[PDB]
């Protein structure tokens, strides 16, 4: 909050603008990275209520209805196992929506094979 | 936004233009009366700063006077007049971002105060911050202007 | 150590932020690391010099932080591009690419 | 009044291990559940500390160089040790510091005292002869099988005399117990004087004279780095000496 | 800017100086550009009986701005007691003459 | 005088470390490509053209 | 080996630690690169005589 310091800082020009712009580019790049990785389907697919897949069990990777976070047991374990002018911007996609995207991808690859990635 | 971008025409998007500061209201010197729960300039035994002084549940040992976190910033302090512990929360600084469509389309804007509660500044509270000037709707559309934490803004007035 | 790759990214970001905070406690050759102490103990002709030393030190610290953040951002972008490729080729199809 | 004590028994001084003792709080700052690395005058871990006895005929009151700081450990019962002698030349030419604890209070004085060659007190069941120019007087509240363990750290930094102390209830008979106890800061004195030598003050027991059973230890403070652990409640529960061994490094 | 001062006060006609005529008579800015010229005038601006025509501001409440002139002959309050425009105990004229 | 020498040498060392980090990123990209070629050309037959 | 220089250098903080950490990261990264490229088999196969 020192006004004399800011008056002396104005002598150095637009360094602050360059630092803010570089950090802004990194911040939008993170959202673009998440968008490229997880948002590869524009249809939110769901598995059928009856899990008759010819003996194949996907309960550890399908979302758990008992959990409020709607995550898979594997995803729940993964989320549990990872632990002055500064601000942290939130990510554009929340963890619930990333989990929803993974659920849609899992439902597509279970019910439809590789057909959903190439068309209907 | 035109001043920040150095242009008279603004493309559709969100532009961080300014930095919201909670201005200090009073000066508290304790060696006057003590004022709590407000962003004030505190001067405790020669240690000065600006912050919100709230009640603390941290029990200091009797020889200790100030408190530091992991990052060596003073977040707890003892009043010298009355031996009580006060937490020093930093004032609610935030980034002021302007959400607008193209100036070819409209001149309506919305203001996002990042990481600032709406009681400390068409007013909507997001996890990204307080959004003023956008009408929150229950419908879901594709993201046009990203706000954050799953919130997006679009022009149809400005909706979030 | 199964999830060490994500933990390294989290630790590096937290450690960079902590280092950027701890650089404020360094005087960089000035009489004090606190601007208020310099402004209260000295007249503006010499306080200007001490504040200038603090400004150049803190600006160098911030430039160092932004530069290393950009390098880490390039690394994370490469990893995310690889992850998007694996999402397209391993999840959305069957890949003939070995390993 | 001065009295020569001529009934002592000659014995070499002893030495023992410091273990992980001598740690004190470097500052007045609360820290919670965090590890803090600090560079200060600290006592080295597992160091060779000089051991002096008071038993009957042993009466160990020599004058020792102060160096950069003094760690004083006391395995004490019945309060024989009462104070300390601080100065450079220990005569009326210079100005000396006196710390005494009599039956009522503790007195801290910075004056030009004439110290005796053998200064002591006495309890029935004589430390100076003159005081010319005083500049600072400070009267305070009393600080105080071997039952009591008294740890003290004395430092002379920027004309400030820091006294750190800790009282510990022990039940060990002879040597220093092995454990961890961080020393709280007790009193900072604005003395602004040069101190290079010190001497312990004991108390006689009269019924000639008899020395009560006490034992004390002198350690020397060296500039080094400690990694201190602060718990949730803010007390130092463990420490790491960064220059002891490569593991702690 | 022309004036007459003492011999020891010529160091105070400079940017960034702390002094008496610097604060209450003639202040130069920190970013001052120009030249200060000083020469001895004992043969002209002095009298054997005492030349009292040159006066300086002994008392003022606050330091001047750069290039600020104070010619107000109002009384100064040097104590707790108000002066009410009248000299007295702790009430002094601000302008005193050089001997 | 040592302050001038320290700031000059620190700037030189920071410049060297930054260039080394950028070159290390380039070499890491080349090594990732080489590992991909080792997996897909040596340990198998690749249908990828060129 | 100048102790006055090191005393003045300590005023600048943890720049040296940052540079050493970056160089150590590059140094372990080179070994990781070689490990990734060449150590793709855990069995040492041998040609017939
Ligand atoms: C699919 O897999 C799950 C998990 O392995 C099976 O759920 C287990 O069922 C047995 C007996 O039915 C229980 O003893 C376990 O405690 C269950 N484990 C969990 C994690 O719930 C499930 O039976 C399998 N089959 C189907 C059709 O869902
Ligand atoms: C106790 O013993 C000491 C040392 O033997 C005495 O100190 C000496 O006193 C004589 C007396 O004139 C001096 O000439 C010496 O210079 C002193 N020596 C030192 C090293 O200072 C002391 O006087 C004795 N106490 C009494 C009461 O006689
Ligand atoms: C302590 O020092 C004495 C001599 O001063 C020596 O004989 C003894 O072995 C030392 N003890 C240790 C543990 O080093
Ligand atoms: C202890 O010393 C103080 C000052 O030297 C004195 O006032 C007090 O009476 C003494 N008490 C006893 C019991 O000797
Ligand atoms: C110190 O004491 C001596 C003897 O009483 C005296 O002559 C001298 O003037 C004193 N010094 C000061 C500074 O008072
Ligand atoms: C302090 O005393 C010692 C021993 O008498 C002496 O060598 C040193 O120069 C003194 N220091 C000062 C600042 O007087
Ligand atoms: C800290 O204090 C609390 C009392 O509120 C106590 O229950 C707890 O055991 C203490 N913890 C330690 C490590 O001393």
Author numbering:
A (entry chain B): 745 to 827, 856 to 892
B (entry chain A): 299 to 329, 531 to 620, 641 to 675, 691 to 694
C (entry chain B): 943 to 1041
D (entry chain B): 14 to 69, 77 to 145, 158 to 176, 185 to 247, 257 to 298
E (entry chain C): 398 to 496
F (entry chain C): 992 to 1041
G (entry chain C): 745 to 793
Excerpt from the publication:
The Delta and Kappa variants of SARS-CoV-2 co-emerged in India in late 2020, with the Delta variant underlying the resurgence of COVID-19, even in countries with high vaccination rates. Herein, we report cryo-electron microscopy (cryo-EM) structures of Delta and Kappa variant S protein trimers – both in the unbound state and in complex with the ACE2 receptor – to gain insight into how their mutations underlie changes in ACE2 binding and antibody neutralisation escape. Within the receptor-binding domain (RBD) of the S protein, both the Kappa and Delta variants share an identical substitutional mutation (L452R) with the previously emerged variants of interest B.1.427/429 (Epsilon). Finally, the P681R mutation (present in all B.1.617 lineages) immediately precedes the furin cleavage consensus sequence (682-RRSR/SVA-688), with initial reports suggesting that the P681R mutation enhances cleavage, and consequently S protein post-fusion transition.
Having identified that residue identity at position 484 likely affects head-to-head S protein oligomerization, we aimed to further probe the chemical properties at 484 that mediate this dimerisation. We therefore hypothesised that charge neutrality at position 484 (as seen in the Q484, but not E484 or the recently emerged K484 S proteins) may be sufficient to reduce charge–charge repulsion at this site and therefore allow dimerisation. To test this, we performed site-directed mutagenesis to substitute an alanine at position 484 (Q484A) in the Kappa S protein, purified the trimer, and performed structural studies. The oligomerization state of S proteins harbouring charged residues at 484 (E484, K484), along with the Q484A and Q484I mutations demonstrate that abrogation of charge at position 484 is necessary but not sufficient to permit dimerisation. Rather, a combination of charge neutralisation and additional contacts enabled by sidechains at position 484 is required for S protein dimerisation.
